[PDB]
């Protein structure tokens, strides 16, 4: 055995030693290996399956059954040796060097007539020693193979079978494909009940079952990108480590939704006390950057609300929403607070310009070129965003100014919470919160009355003749396809006059919180904000006379004085009023 | 008469009297919004394999340029990406035996079906690397929603005596007839088994999928060891309140999540309602003032 | 350890000899270090940041506090050896070349037992020796670094993790991203002033503090296609190769 | 230039840590030759470079950098740039390259 | 040869300094004749034979119009002695 094992391992001795994590649940696989090793020709088996499935701990598993003694049949007592292709292959810098191994090994193996080769990743032993292209492993192997002899089984991934190994069909002839499933949810729970015992002993800690459970359940939901056998491992495995670096402990369900939390964004730790607490009172946190909206901010904690108690729908995003209103009224200003208060920092807003979506092509941005095409290789601009973010809000700007066939594509993001890129993957967005700002119908705010004489002169609010118009022009925009999938559509009310002095005051804060950089500061009497609030009202653009006025009526003196040297570091410029009427104008005193 | 179509279909793919050079059926599941198309495809998958998620599902939206029909066969010789072969067609060859739906076909350019005759026909399709992917065992199912932009229609124009004895089933049925022959070419039309045309939603059916999304809620719920009980009259109430005849069943979810999971979010956050306790839903007032009363309960 | 020296460097012997530079504001990215170089399986760090962060430096911090500060069980006294692989490639003309060397290192490794390695400039293993019969350096360290028989830190931009690390499935498997943030304004100001002694030390000039808020702050302003951490530093080196050649 | 700073080095106009500090430049071609493989490649590198590690004060001026680093495009071409990354690396001697 | 001193001996930065270049061009029609006319005689020694002038602008005439692959202060010698081969076996 002494050549033998200077190139493989013997992993039935390992099996003997306990070295060899268990194997739960993989009766039918070993079973079928056990049958097609029995088969008098072609009796080689190979397991393809994706990365993280127990394609080796099937292996594993079948060496542990041989050991055991539970195999019956003809394999009794084997000897099963994992086959290391990288002893061949190095030094044998001369001719018939890899060659003679490969050929001593092999008589080793047909003397004593009871080895059972193992060669892991199978996909490399097209090109083994072709030096210059003709005698490898594989044609030394091709004819011991076909007619009976050198048992062999072989581990693949999908991928690699199919680029590599379906290169060399007369290799690919002699092996026996076996398809290995992910386990399910309960095969999963099993698996970690069995692996408890040795990462307890490693780790030196001690889990429940309810972290099992919880570690099961959250990797199958919430992290999507790898197979269900090792991605929950994984979870057990960090907890277990983060434990121990601290210091019997104790591993529960909560630190491992803490350490899914912290790894993927997604916040499905336990609810606390004061988050409950903030939860319940997000109307006011919203309200402390937006005068008014409140039917939008009801429905924005509404939907946080949903989806922070546990009842939102497992197979769609947290909400959607679409913001019809007038020009200037707090959108757009309503989705960064939203940002803003979701992740501490409003500029984390995934931001999108319907503006430049006109042309029909442009969907190509959404989720990249096909096969064969420029820029194919980068797949996706809005996948590549939201995968890298999954917990996010999305926005869409502006809808009214892009092609009708570009929301198409968010048939399956709103229904089915999923979009695939044109290199065929797939992004969830079943964690986002989807805003769409439009201003349809929002364009006639005027003439309170009916066109044509009347008599009754059928009064009615602005408010319902605004919801009715956007209702109504939201119907003949969109297909009812499409706004049937919508969960929220919130109209926007016009801005009164009272809300105008809440914001000449924010405006000037921010605008105190500028200034007090460079050790100032300002100062406001009411007559002056009374002053700005009538001066810049305008109820049809907004909000955004006002920045205009308070830019060029403070912004504009301070700046004159800073140049002038009127002011130094540590003056509080308060501002006041004169006149009367048209005379009324604001006046600057120094302080300190 | 969509179940009964599937049915048929099976039992004559079991029963061994299946055509050997076809697929075992290819259907055209036509109709409204909400109105179980998706559904059906998913209920379909679930019985057969063993749930939802072994569906094969393609969402057409994203081939609105005829330039993306290499995303079913793949890069020619001398391109990037040709060595990674189709997407549709590795599916289909790692897994003979499956359920293959087209969601949305009228949304895509009406030539990527044109790729679909040799399926519907020759059950085959060769990828760009010339090998032969048949499709013998599977299940087609393409929905669309084509000829249903009228079913809130009373009148056309012009003057008529009497009226359209027809029910809104038999003009549906005309329209999405004519919408097809105008939308796709007679030899692709020729070549699929069933074209069915799904009926709206009656207020019966509304009371009977008010439990579905209720036992729903309560899984949800129970996922946090806590439940929810309903009484025939908020069963009733839930029914009343969210009826479209037009949108489907989806306002009637949109209803059930406003007058039930924000109240409960309400009361979990707060700390009504925790686990160990199941909530008990009732109804008070009469009339049009009938509200929702939650009760807890041990 | 003459075979490591050959194709690597050390950092603990080096850091015993104050030879690397003090790390600043990093405890939270070496804390994350620790808590996946403990894991029993896939224990392998690797650290994905844009070029200019301290990617190295979070490693010389770890190398400090292994030769001394808090360092957990089953990492003390253990040795870091940054190994490259652009040497290890280098001189192989023949059938199995490569595959000596990079055996008889892993060799080495096993048989001390108590090394950790350092691959600097990751995203370089997957093509390490990608000969039309060679096998490839990936395929052999698979199955180690799967069962965490060996332990390694990686180092990588993002561009090329995501354009040739997520691409191959198997080989992404089995290492643990950690992200590395660009330092903030006060992160980087601080970093300075802790900096501002060894090249005071090296120049034999004198650095005000309001030199340093310059140079950060303008750093930060009109240079864009480099990265904080490194431009303001690389400003107060030509600063002070300037004043000395003047003098 | 090359030579320009060699001479300025030699009557002193150059600054201080460079005003007594040997100026030398390497060919391939010594070393290249009386070799039969890449074994005496190493040999003679390593010793001159504990040599001038030793020394501690010798400038290696190596024209042709381009050739030392991109070698490696076809067979038979030396590259050792790789070979001279490690030192760098450390910084142990200043390089001075043309390209 | 040109190209191939273009090719490798340009990227010799070391010979750079060290090398001067000269270039040598193809000779005309009257250069190949007063070539063919010198050659002559060591030709007509070793074929045992005798050529003539209309023989030698002939062939450096057939040479630079209906050959293109060689060139030619090459080929018109190969024409003559391939003649004088000829003349030579046949007795
Ligand atoms: N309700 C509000 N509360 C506070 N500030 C507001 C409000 N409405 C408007 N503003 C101010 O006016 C600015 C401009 O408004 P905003 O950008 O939100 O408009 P919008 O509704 O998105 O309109 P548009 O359709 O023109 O994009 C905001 O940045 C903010 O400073
Ligand atoms: N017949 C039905 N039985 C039970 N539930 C139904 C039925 N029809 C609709 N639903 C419910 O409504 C939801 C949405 O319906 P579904 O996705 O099946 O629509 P669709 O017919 O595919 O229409 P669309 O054209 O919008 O895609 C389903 O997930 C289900 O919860
Ligand atoms: N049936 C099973 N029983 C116990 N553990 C399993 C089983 N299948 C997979 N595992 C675990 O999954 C982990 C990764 O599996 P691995 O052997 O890497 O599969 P592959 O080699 O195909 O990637 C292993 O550590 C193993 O413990
Ligand atoms: N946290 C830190 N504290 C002190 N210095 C740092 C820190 N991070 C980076 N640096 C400095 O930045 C310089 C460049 O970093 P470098 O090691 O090149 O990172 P990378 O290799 O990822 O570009 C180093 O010389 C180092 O001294
Ligand atoms: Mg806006
Ligand atoms: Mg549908």
Do not use: W
């Amino acid at each position: 055995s002494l050549v033998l094992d200077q190139f493989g391992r013997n992993l039935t001795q390992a099996a003997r030693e306990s070295k060899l994590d268990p194997v739960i649940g993989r009766e039918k696989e070993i079973e079928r290996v056990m049958q097609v090793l029995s088969r008098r020709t072609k009796n080689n088996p190979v397991l393809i399956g994706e990365p993280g499935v127990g394609k080796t701990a099937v292996v594993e598993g079948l060496a542990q059954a041989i050991v055991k003694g539970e195999v019956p049949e003809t394999l009794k007592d084997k000897h099963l040796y994992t086959l290391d292709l990288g002893a061949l292959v190095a030094g044998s810098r001369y001719r018939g060097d890899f060659e003679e191994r490969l050929k001593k090994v092999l008589k080793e193996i047909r003397t004593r007539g009871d080895i059972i080769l193992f060669i892991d990743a199978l996909h490399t032993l097209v090109g083994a020693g072709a030096a210059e292209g003709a005698i490898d492993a594989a044609s030394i192997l091709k004819p011991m193979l076909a007619r009976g002899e050198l048992q062999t089984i072989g581990a693949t991934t999908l991928d690699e079978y199919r680029k590599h190994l379906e290169k060399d069909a007369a290799l690919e002839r002699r092996f026996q494909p076996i398809q290995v499933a992910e386990p399910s949810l309960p095969h999963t729970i099993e698996i970690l009940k069995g692996l408890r015992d040795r990462y307890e002993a490693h780790h030196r800690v001690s889990i429940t079952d309810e972290a099992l459970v919880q570690a099961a359940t959250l990797a199958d939901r919430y992290i999507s990108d790898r197979f269900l056998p090792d991605k929950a491992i994984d979870l057990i495995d960090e907890a277990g480590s983060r434990m121990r670096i601290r210091r019997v402990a104790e591993v529960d369900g909560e630190l491992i939704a803490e350490v899914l939390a912290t790894a993927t964004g997604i916040p499905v730790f336990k609810l606390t006390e004061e988050e409950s607490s903030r939860l319940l009172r997000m109307e006011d946190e919203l309200h402390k950057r937006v005068i008014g909206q409140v039917d939008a901010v009801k429905a924005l904690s509404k939907a946080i609300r949903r989806t922070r108690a546990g009842l939102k729908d497992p197979k769609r995003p947290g909400g959607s929403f679409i913001f019809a209103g007038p020009s200037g009224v707090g959108k757009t200003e309503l989705s960064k607070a939203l940002a803003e208060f979701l992740f501490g920092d409003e500029d984390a807003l995934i931001s999108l310009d319907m503006s430049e979506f006109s042309e029909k092509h442009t969907v190509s941005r959404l989720f990249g070129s096909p096969p064969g095409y420029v820029g194919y290789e980068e797949g996706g601009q809005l996948t590549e965003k939201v995968r890298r973010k999954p917990f996010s809000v999305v926005l869409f700007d502006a809808v009214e100014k892009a092609h009708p066939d570009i929301f198409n594509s968010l048939l399956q993001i709103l229904e089915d919470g999923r979009l695939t890129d044109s290199q065929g993957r797939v992004v969830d967005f079943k964690n986002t919160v989807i805003i769409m700002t439009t201003n349809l119908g929002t364009r006639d705010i005027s003439k309170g009355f009916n066109l044509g004489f009347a008599a009754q002169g059928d009064t009615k609010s602005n408010y319902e003749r605004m919801k009715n118009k956007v209702s109504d022009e939201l119907k003949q925009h969109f297909r009812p396809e499409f706004l049937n999938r919508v969960d929220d559509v919130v109209v926007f009310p016009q801005l009164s006059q009272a809300d105008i002095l809440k914001i000449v005051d924010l405006m000037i804060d921010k605008v105190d919180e500028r200034l007090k950089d460079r050790d100032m500061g300002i100062e406001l009497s009411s007559s002056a904000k009374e002053l700005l609030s009538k001066k810049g009202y305008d109820p049809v653009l907004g909000a955004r006379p006002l920045r205009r006025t308070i830019q060029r009526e403070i912004e504009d003196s301070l700046s004159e004085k800073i140049l002038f040297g009127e002011l130094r570091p540590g003056h509080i410029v308060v501002v006041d009023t004169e006149g009367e009427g048209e005379t009324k104008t604001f006046t600057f005193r120094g302080e300190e």
